[PDB]
Ligand binder design. Sequence first.
Ligand SMILES: [Mg+2]
Ligand SMILES: [Mg+2]
Ligand SMILES: [Mg+2]
Ligand SMILES: [Mg+2]
Ligand SMILES: [Mg+2]
Ligand SMILES: [Mg+2]
Ligand SMILES: [Mg+2]
Ligand SMILES: [Mg+2]
Ligand SMILES: [Mg+2]
Ligand SMILES: [Mg+2]
Ligand SMILES: [Mg+2]
Ligand SMILES: [Mg+2]
Ligand SMILES: [Mg+2]
Ligand SMILES: [Mg+2]
Ligand SMILES: [Mg+2]
Ligand SMILES: [Mg+2]
Ligand SMILES: [Mg+2]
Ligand SMILES: [Mg+2]
Ligand SMILES: [Mg+2]
Ligand SMILES: [Mg+2]
Ligand SMILES: [Mg+2]
Ligand SMILES: [Mg+2]
Ligand SMILES: [Mg+2]
Ligand SMILES: [Mg+2]
Ligand SMILES: [Mg+2]
Ligand SMILES: [Mg+2]
Ligand SMILES: [Mg+2]
Ligand SMILES: [Mg+2]
Ligand SMILES: [Mg+2]
Ligand SMILES: [Mg+2]
Ligand SMILES: [Mg+2]
Ligand SMILES: [Mg+2]
Ligand SMILES: [Mg+2]
Ligand SMILES: [Mg+2]
Ligand SMILES: [Mg+2]
Ligand SMILES: [Mg+2]
Ligand SMILES: [Mg+2]
Ligand SMILES: [Mg+2]
Ligand SMILES: [Mg+2]
Ligand SMILES: [Mg+2]
Ligand SMILES: [Mg+2]
Ligand SMILES: [Mg+2]
Ligand SMILES: [Mg+2]
Ligand SMILES: [Mg+2]
Ligand SMILES: [Mg+2]
Ligand SMILES: [Mg+2]
Ligand SMILES: [Mg+2]
Lengths: 129, 123
Amino acid sequence: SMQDPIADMLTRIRNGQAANKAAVTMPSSKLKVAIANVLKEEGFIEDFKVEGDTKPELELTLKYFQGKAVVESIQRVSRPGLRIYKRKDELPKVMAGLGIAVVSTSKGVMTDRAARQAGLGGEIICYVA
Amino acid sequence: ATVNQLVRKPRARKVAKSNVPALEACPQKRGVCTRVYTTTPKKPNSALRKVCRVRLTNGFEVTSYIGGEGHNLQEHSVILIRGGRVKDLPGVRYHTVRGALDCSGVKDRKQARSKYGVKRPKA
RNA sequence: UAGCUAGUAGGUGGGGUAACGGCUCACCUAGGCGACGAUCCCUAGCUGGUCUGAGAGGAUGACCAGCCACACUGGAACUGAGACACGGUCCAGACUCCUACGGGAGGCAGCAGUGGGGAAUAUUGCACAAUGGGCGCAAGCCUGAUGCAGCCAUGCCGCGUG
RNA sequence: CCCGCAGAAGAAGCACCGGCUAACUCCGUGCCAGCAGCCGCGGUAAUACGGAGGGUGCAAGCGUUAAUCGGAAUUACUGGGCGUAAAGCGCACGCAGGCGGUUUGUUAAGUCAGAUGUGAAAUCCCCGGGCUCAACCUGGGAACUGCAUCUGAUACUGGCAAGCUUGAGUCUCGUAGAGGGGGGUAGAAUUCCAGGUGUAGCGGUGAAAUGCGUAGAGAUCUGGAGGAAUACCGGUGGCGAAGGCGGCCCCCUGGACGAAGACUGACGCUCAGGUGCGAAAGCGUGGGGAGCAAACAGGAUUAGAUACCCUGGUAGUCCACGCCGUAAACGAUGUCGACUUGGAGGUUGUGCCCUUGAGGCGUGGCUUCCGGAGCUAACGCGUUAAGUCGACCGCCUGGGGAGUACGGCCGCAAGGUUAAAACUCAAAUGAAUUGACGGGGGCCCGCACAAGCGGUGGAGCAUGUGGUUUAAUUCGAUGCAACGCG
RNA sequence: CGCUUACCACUUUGUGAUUCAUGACUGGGGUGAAGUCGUAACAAGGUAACCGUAGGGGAACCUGCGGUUGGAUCACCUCCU
RNA sequence: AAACUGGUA
RNA sequence: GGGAGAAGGCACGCUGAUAUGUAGGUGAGGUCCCUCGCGGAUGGAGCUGAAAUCAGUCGAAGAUACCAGCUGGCUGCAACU
Ligand SMILES: [Mg+2]
Ligand SMILES: [Mg+2]
Ligand SMILES: [Mg+2]
Ligand SMILES: [Mg+2]
Ligand SMILES: [Mg+2]
Ligand SMILES: [Mg+2]
Ligand SMILES: [Mg+2]
Ligand SMILES: [Mg+2]
Ligand SMILES: [Mg+2]
Ligand SMILES: [Mg+2]
Ligand SMILES: [Mg+2]
Ligand SMILES: [Mg+2]
Ligand SMILES: [Mg+2]
Ligand SMILES: [Mg+2]
Ligand SMILES: [Mg+2]
Ligand SMILES: [Mg+2]
Ligand SMILES: [Mg+2]
Ligand SMILES: [Mg+2]
Ligand SMILES: [Mg+2]
Ligand SMILES: [Mg+2]
Ligand SMILES: [Mg+2]
Ligand SMILES: [Mg+2]
Ligand SMILES: [Mg+2]
Ligand SMILES: [Mg+2]
Ligand SMILES: [Mg+2]
Ligand SMILES: [Mg+2]
Ligand SMILES: [Mg+2]
Ligand SMILES: [Mg+2]
Ligand SMILES: [Mg+2]
Ligand SMILES: [Mg+2]
Ligand SMILES: [Mg+2]
Ligand SMILES: [Mg+2]
Ligand SMILES: [Mg+2]
Ligand SMILES: [Mg+2]
Ligand SMILES: [Mg+2]
Ligand SMILES: [Mg+2]
Ligand SMILES: [Mg+2]
Ligand SMILES: [Mg+2]
Ligand SMILES: [Mg+2]
Ligand SMILES: [Mg+2]
Ligand SMILES: [Mg+2]
Ligand SMILES: [Mg+2]
Ligand SMILES: [Mg+2]
Ligand SMILES: [Mg+2]
Ligand SMILES: [Mg+2]
Ligand SMILES: [Mg+2]
Ligand SMILES: [Mg+2]
C-alpha cells in the first residue's frame, strides 16, 4: 500500500526527468503544493497547477537545460520509517551550498538557506541538486 | 538490514582469538623441554628441523622450534619461549629464545647477534 | 535461562529509627514483577578520564582526582555526634608461635623488607626545614601523610661522544 | 647556578639490504645446513641460508615477543549485501509489534526557538607567563556536544473530535477453467483361468545364456475373472497461495475475471512467536494386488562386477483412516504499493461502427518471446525488472570441521527443528577470454583406410644395438624422430 | 547477678540441580611424499549429473520412487507460395 | 562388445 | 498410568477459653396454610456433637499398652494377575 506520498512525488519527478517528459500527473496535497512552491522559487520547475474539487490533481512542469535536466539528483531524507530533525547551528547543505534542502520549520516549509537565516530548524524533507 | 531489525537485534562485532595462546597474554613463558623431536616439513620444503615439546610452568604441552645452528637442549632443561610460528611445521606456534636460561647462544655468529643471543666480540 | 514471587503486593492498628518506609509485628484483601527480557547462570569496582580513529565508533579504567566496598574467615554489638571500627571489643573457625604443660599470644590488601608465584616490578634510607593534619592558650610533641634522597634506559625531553 | 686549571683527552651501538620496502657484490654450502610477517628461497654460478666488503634506517638506544585501535566500507547508524560468488523461510492465514490515503478544528506529546540552573577540579584545545630550550609547571578563555525547569512557535509526526472517496470491501447480471471432496459408469490394452485349431520352436541380446515348450509352447479364435491408467483432443493451453491438478456423467463446494449501477467510509500493508496446507520415499491398522519394480535368485559381460544388460521377483506403487513435514519444494528471484520508450504472439471478457466477411477502431485480466534507457563483475534482467522509490519481514559475514556434537522441542520409528566449539589451510568461489582435450557435431586432406603387388616376422649369413662376460670389451645416439646411427 | 523465651554464626543429616576435572573402552574429524585396492566426478567422463527418501554392497558407490538443468546430439529430398 | 592407470617437486 | 507410602521432615497426653458445648446433625412446643390432614411452610426448645487456635500443666518418654511397612543402589530371568 501507499506509505509515503512525498517519496512518490520525488520518484515521479526523477522518473520524468530521466524520461525527458513535459509535465507530470499526481494527486495534490498540502506538502506536495508547499514543496512545489519551494521548487518553483528555486528554479527547478517552470510551474505547477492544481485543479479539481472532489479529486484534486497536481501537475508539475519540468525544466531542461540545452541538453540536460535541471534536477541533477533528488532523494528523500526523513523517511517515514526513520525521521530526522536537525539543530539550528548545524543544518545540511547540498553540494557545499550549491544545492538546497527542503526543511519543514515551524514557520512553514522553506529551503535550508532561508531556515538558517530565519534562525529555526526543523524536519529535513529532501535534498535537491 | 532495516533499522527496525537492527533495533530489535544490534550488529555483533566479529570475535577474535590469539594464534599463540600462552595463558593470559604473556610475552614469554618458561618450560622444561619434555623431549626433543626432529620432524619433516610440508611438500615444497625438504629439511629436518629441531623441535621440542615444552611443558609451561603454569600452562600446557606445546611444541616449540629451536632456531639457529646447533643447541644444547636435552631431556629436562628450563628454557623461555616466545610467540611466532613455523609455517612448514604444523602444530608449532612458538620459538625457543636462544641465549636465555639454560639455552645457549649460537656459535660463531657475526650477523644478527641480538637475535640468537650471541655476545659481541669484545675489542 | 520463560515464567518468578507469602512479608510477597496493598490497607488498618501497634511497635521501632535522627528521619519516611513491611523497617518489624497482629489482622484484612490477592495481589506484585515479566517479552520494553522478570527469574536463573557467567563475568566485572563505577566515573572525570586514557589509547586509537577524519568523524561516528572500538578498546580500556595503570598514575592523578571524585564515589563505592573490604581489612586472616564468619557473626554481633558496645563506646561515640559520627563505626557495626585497618594498627578497638566479644564469640566461633583455619593456621602459626611461647610454655615451668597449669596456661597464653598473633593478624603488613600502612612504610621498608623476607619467603613463595611469575617473563616481570625498587631502600629493612634522611627530615618534620616547607604544606597539611591530631592535642595544646602558647612554647611544643606526634605525623613511613608529606618533602627529599637511594635502585631501574621503564617512558618523554635535552646535551655530548669534538 | 657562576668561576678557574689541564687536556681530543673519558663517552656508539642495534637492525636491515628478493618484492611489499630505503639500501649489492664476492666466497662457503648444495632441498643439507638453514631462513621465513605474506608471496616463498636452498637439490654446485643463491642479490632470500652462513661469512666478508659495501650500503640503507634509527641512535643511547636498536630489535623481537605480548596487547588495543587503524588500515578493515571485513557487522556497513554515518557506511554493505542475498538470480549464478555466503545469503528469500516450501507456501499461506494471522496476534503482539512496525508503518499508514485525504479536509478542517483542537491539544502541544514528539519536534524547533529563547532564558535560567547545572555539567567538580585535573586532563584535551587557543592565547600568554616561568624553569638557560624542550619535556615539565602555570594565568585566562573555550570546550565540557549532556541533563532539568520555565517561557513561546504549530510546518511535519502523535493524541482527541468531525468529514470525504481515489486504498480496501459488499451487492446485481455474465464468462472461462485437469480448482477441491464424494458417488457412478464406458472403451482400449496387459495379465490370468476354461475351451477350440495347430506344432516346433518361443523369448531375449551388440552376440548369448538363463527361462518357457512334445506332460503340446509360441501364434490364432471363443468365453470369463480381476487390478490399474485414461491413448489424439493436448497447445511459446488452462486452474490453484504453494505442493499440484487431464476418459465421461451426477451431487456438494472454493477462487478468479468482465459490464455498468448502488452501498460502507481508511475498515489498510507487513508480520517475530503461533496455526494450517505441504511431491516422492517412509511408518501403523485393515483391504486389494493386473502391470511395474528396491531387496533377493539365476544367466551374461569383465582381470574382478555383491553394477550397467537379460530372465524371474518380495516390500512398495492402489484404497480408507492416522503419522512423517522433508526435495535442484527453482523463476536458485519475499510480500504490498507507485513511476518509467516499444515490437511480435497466445488465452479469456467487453464497447462503437460504413455493422456485408474468419472484418475496422478501443478498452480490461492472465500469459510467451525479442529488445531501448537504466542496472549489473559479467552472463544477463528489462512495464510480469535484476530500472527509480516507499513499508515490513527473513537471511549472509573465508574454505573445511558442520547443518555436525551437546542441550531443548516434536515423532511409533526412520529422523525432523534450533544450533556450537576445538582444530586445520591460504586460499575456497562467481562470470568471462585464449589455448588444449572430448569414447560431441559438421566439412576437408595424406599409400590413412579400402582395392592390388611385393615384403618382414620362419632358415643360413652380413651388420648395428641391448644384455652378459672380459684386462679392456673407448665415447656418444634411445618411441615415432636410436639401433648398416657419429 | 543468676535463670528463662525470641533472633542468629559455626556445625551436622537427607535428597536434588548445575559446573570443572579425570576414566578402561569406543565413534567420527584433521594433517602427513613418494604404501595397498579400485576409478566415483570433471568431455555424452564412456550407465548424464545432482536433490530428497528407501534398500544393498571392501571402497569410492549401485538400484528403486519423485523432482531439477546447474544437459551434449534430430519433422532424412516428401509440404506451404 | 569391450576400452584401467600414469610417484614427488 | 506409574515409580510413590519413593526418600525425608513437623505435630500428637491432660486442663481452660474462644464457645457456661463452636461448625454440623437431629428436632418438640407455638403460628400460618386447609392443598383434604401418616399433609405443607415457618419456627426453633430439647438432644447429640467433631475439627482447629491460644494459654497453662505432668512425666525420661503422650501413634505411651495390644495391633502396626525396614529402606536405598547395580544386575540375570520371566512382560504382568
Ligand atoms: Mg504503620
Ligand atoms: Mg523503602
Ligand atoms: Mg576508521
Ligand atoms: Mg567499562
Ligand atoms: Mg550510641
Ligand atoms: Mg580503628
Ligand atoms: Mg597492620
Ligand atoms: Mg608492604
Ligand atoms: Mg620465581
Ligand atoms: Mg633523545
Ligand atoms: Mg629496493
Ligand atoms: Mg656460491
Ligand atoms: Mg569498521
Ligand atoms: Mg559485501
Ligand atoms: Mg519462494
Ligand atoms: Mg498476510
Ligand atoms: Mg498521515
Ligand atoms: Mg512538546
Ligand atoms: Mg617561554
Ligand atoms: Mg592550564
Ligand atoms: Mg572539567
Ligand atoms: Mg495532526
Ligand atoms: Mg464475497
Ligand atoms: Mg514464521
Ligand atoms: Mg506414498
Ligand atoms: Mg502402508
Ligand atoms: Mg498393506
Ligand atoms: Mg530387473
Ligand atoms: Mg531446505
Ligand atoms: Mg515442483
Ligand atoms: Mg521448475
Ligand atoms: Mg532457497
Ligand atoms: Mg530481454
Ligand atoms: Mg541435526
Ligand atoms: Mg538434537
Ligand atoms: Mg602419392
Ligand atoms: Mg591395405
Ligand atoms: Mg630371420
Ligand atoms: Mg663425456
Ligand atoms: Mg657403446
Ligand atoms: Mg650416456
Ligand atoms: Mg568415471
Ligand atoms: Mg557417468
Ligand atoms: Mg539433508
Ligand atoms: Mg592404481
Ligand atoms: Mg551373571
Ligand atoms: Mg512370573
